[PDB]
Design a protein around this ligand. Structure first.
Ligand SMILES: [Mg+2]
Length: 756
């Protein structure tokens, strides 16, 4: 049986869209299912998402905005020399182009410099700032950098060179000493949308310096806003619909040349900006510097754009190869560590190119679902510089700050970070992170999760229904791309495609829906036999010879078969060791939790629960329901260890309880050792059941006891009619014995198939 890699959380929309609006707004079932799983139901929201009125807030409401506008205007008037300081991100290259063109249109002596990731690193560098002063630069406008360059800015500011900081990266407790700081998230000011990218901040500064901005600027903001992965809500959303509009209607010279090098000519949307255009502009600044990418974006002559688009695409080539090699070596090292049981993948080797290390780390976290540090051992500089990527259950900042004594310089956040340390401290640091992770392994679950937006049926996979979903685009952060679940799907056709037969081609269901699972062509032999499979994935339209067809890109795959096995008398024959980790053991309080697998009923196990063993008899059917209603398994093992039974002993009727109280009221104080047998006689009950009755009377505090001597509390609180917690426990215990221990497995299966 194929095992799911993730653990699937399907959103069950509590609210649904009116069947009137569904019709008033021509909402096909797929767009309707997506909207509802984002809970966007009211007419405003739906219109907001489908509408195109642009989102535009006075850029004058930005931090130090007017203060800045005039500082730039004056420099152009006094023939001052300008320098735009930028970054090698696609946001920084797109932001530089916008500002340089804006200043060129204002007739300014503008020049630009992008720091080298290796020779200079990110942000202001003393040498460059001094060099600019030496070149007569009087004003430096930074883009996607500066908010954390206090020292460098002050030095040059004291040299007489004003610095205007424009950034969107998290601000610190201290703001650098500079003429002006334009930041959407600045303490002293409040701007409607605070999730703008560097290009977005530049667009607003431009819209303020020049009233009407060239349309190229909108496309450039779109490229950077989708690459910096900023929130795709409010403003960012409109600029992308506009910038995606521009790239199709009036495609720029610079960008055209690029996609001609990739060989891409189909309609352009956010994924093109994500997977195709974005990653090419970064390649240059990850191997060589990105001035080329800026020069490509700045050029509108087909001849040079084409010559320059060649030099970029060459770098995209090499990044694929350099990443491919580093990963081959690192995937080999990671397999050993995880096989030895590491929980933090700290991989450190030599000749590892640093410009691609963050990339290599993302492939490692996706393949292993573990937080990873990827380091290059530079023995020519006795430093280990590298990158880190995280999982949600772990903050990369915290765990490094707790181990910061072994680290020389480390900066980043919860999901990612950059570090420089000593080659001799790596082996010491790995154990520390592993210790921190193996302690969190208790308080926290580390198994990968996937959020499922919609449960789609074969009757929704229509070309019309799938393109109408191209109406909710653009998709991205804060408006994530939908993930669909499809169950009870037959594996009609199965094939292994690719030179190395690594991709899997499949036909699904009775309607034979084409599906592809990349890098999983090794599962063909298992899916050859006709078998029903549940699937998670995205829906798109593949077009061949003018014929459009629905296609599903699978992300995860599970076998629909749910197996329930009777070991109700074969406990010692379980096919696994109690300490197997992959197996979850559902137990009840009477036993002490010895292993982490042992989780009590009702308690929320969050470890992947593909193989679940019901070791102890549930205290209640609903407690099992709770511990079952959270179950995603392929094989359930029902052992149900119990030491005694109550099925035949029975619960005394309520007429007998009063006939016990009768004896108690007659003497007030009684000793059960001498009076119990006579007591049990007139009650026509047994010794064990008398304890139960006295134990409910003591629970209801109707009586008190001391060394066998039972005493009456006279008038007690009228808590209930013998409806005590102890009385209830018995009711539930007899309930579980009748349905689970002393019933037929067939009907037990027909109940476990009722819950889940
Ligand atoms: Mg940025």
């Amino acid at each position: 049986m194929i095992k799911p890699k993730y653990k699937w959380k399907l959103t069950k929309p509590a609210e649904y869209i009116s069947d009137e609006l569904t019709s008033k707004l021509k909402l096909t079932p797929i767009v309707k299912k997506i909207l509802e799983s984002k809970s966007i139901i009211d007419e405003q929201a739906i219109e907001s998402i489908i509408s195109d009125t642009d989102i535009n807030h006075d850029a004058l409401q930005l931090s130090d905005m007017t203060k800045t506008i005039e500082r730039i205007k004056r420099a152009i008037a006094n023939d001052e020399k300008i320098l735009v300081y930028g970054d090698y991100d696609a946001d920084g290259v797109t932001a530089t182009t916008i500002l340089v063109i804006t200043l060129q249109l204002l007739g300014a002596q503008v020049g630009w410099h992008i720091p080298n990731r290796f020779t200079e690193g990110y942000g202001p560098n003393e040498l460059a700032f001094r060099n600019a002063h030496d070149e007569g630069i009087t004003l430096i406008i930074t883009v996607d950098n500066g908010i954390q360059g206090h020292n460098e800015i002050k030095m040059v500011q004291d040299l007489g060179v004003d610095v205007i900081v424009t950034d969107h990266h998290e601000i610190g407790s201290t703001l650098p000493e500079a003429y002006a700081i334009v930041h959407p998230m600045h303490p002293s000011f409040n701007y409607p949308f605070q999730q703008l990218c560097g290009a977005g901040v530049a667009y607003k500064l431009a819209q303020a310096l020049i009233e009407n901005v060239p349309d190229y600027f909108k496309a450039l903001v779109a490229i950077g806003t989708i690459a910096d992965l900023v929130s795709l809500t409010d403003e960012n959303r409109s600029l992308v619909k506009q910038g995606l509009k521009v790239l199709n209607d009036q495609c720029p010279t610079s960008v055209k040349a690029l996609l001609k090098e990739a060989g891409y000519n189909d309609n352009i949307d956010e994924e093109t900006i994500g997977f195709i255009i974005g990653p090419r502009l970064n390649a240059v600044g990850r191997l060589d510097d990105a001035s080329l990418a800026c020069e490509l974006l700045m050029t509108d002559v087909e001849e040079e754009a084409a010559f320059l688009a060649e030099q970029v695409e060459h770098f995209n080539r090499e990044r694929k190869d350099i990443v491919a090699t580093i990963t081959e070596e690192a995937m080999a090292m990671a397999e050993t560590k995880v096989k030895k049981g590491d929980l933090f993948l700290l991989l450190a080797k030599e000749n590892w190119h640093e410009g691609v290390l963050g990339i290599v780390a993302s492939k490692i976290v996706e393949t292993f679902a573990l937080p990873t540090l990827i380091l290059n051992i530079d023995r020519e500089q006795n430093h280990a510089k590298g990158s880190a990527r995280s999982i949600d259950q772990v903050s990369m900042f915290e765990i490094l700050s707790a181990h910061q004594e072994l680290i020389a310089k480390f900066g980043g956040h919860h999901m990612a970070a950059g570090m420089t340390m000593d080659i001799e401290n790596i082996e010491s640091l790995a154990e520390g992170l592993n210790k921190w992770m193996k302690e969190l392994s208790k308080t926290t679950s580390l198994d990968p999760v996937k959020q499922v937006d919609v449960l789609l049926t074969e009757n929704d996979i229509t070309i019309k229904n799938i393109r109408d979903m191209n109406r909710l685009r653009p998709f991205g952060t804060d408006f994530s791309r939908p993930i669909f679940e499809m169950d009870d799907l037959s594996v009609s056709s199965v094939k292994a495609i690719g030179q190395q037969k690594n991709h899997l081609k499949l036909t699904l269901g009775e309607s034979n829906i084409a599906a592809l699972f990349w890098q999983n062509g090794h599962l063909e032999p298992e899916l050859q036999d006709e078998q029903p499979i549940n699937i998670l994935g995205s829906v798109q339209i593949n077009e061949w010879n003018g014929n459009q067809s629905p296609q599903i890109i699978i992300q995860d795959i599970a076998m629909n078969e749910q197996q329930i096995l009777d070991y109700r008398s074969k406990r010692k024959s379980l096919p696994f060791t109690e300490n197997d980790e992959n197996i979850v053991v559902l137990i009840h309080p009477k036993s002490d939790k010895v292993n982490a697998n042992e989780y009590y009923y009702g308690e929320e196990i969050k470890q992947q629960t593909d193989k679940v063993v019901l070791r102890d008899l549930p205290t209640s059917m609903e407690d099992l329901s709770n511990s079952l209603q959270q179950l995603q398994f392929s094989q359930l093992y029902i052992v149900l260890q119990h030491n005694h039974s109550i099925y035949f002993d029975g619960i005394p009727n309520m007429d007998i309880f009063k006939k016990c109280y009768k004896a108690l009221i007659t003497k007030q104080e009684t000793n059960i050792q001498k009076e119990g047998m006579l007591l049990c006689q007139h009650l026509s009950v047994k010794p064990d059941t008398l304890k139960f009755m006295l134990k409910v009377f003591l629970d209801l505090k109707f009586v008190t006891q001391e060394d066998g001597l039972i005493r009456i509390n006279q008038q007690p609180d009228k808590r209930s009619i013998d409806s005590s917690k102890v009385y209830q426990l018995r009711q539930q215990r007899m309930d579980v014995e009748k349905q689970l221990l002393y019933q037929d497995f067939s009907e037990i299966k027909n109940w476990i198939k009722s819950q889940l």
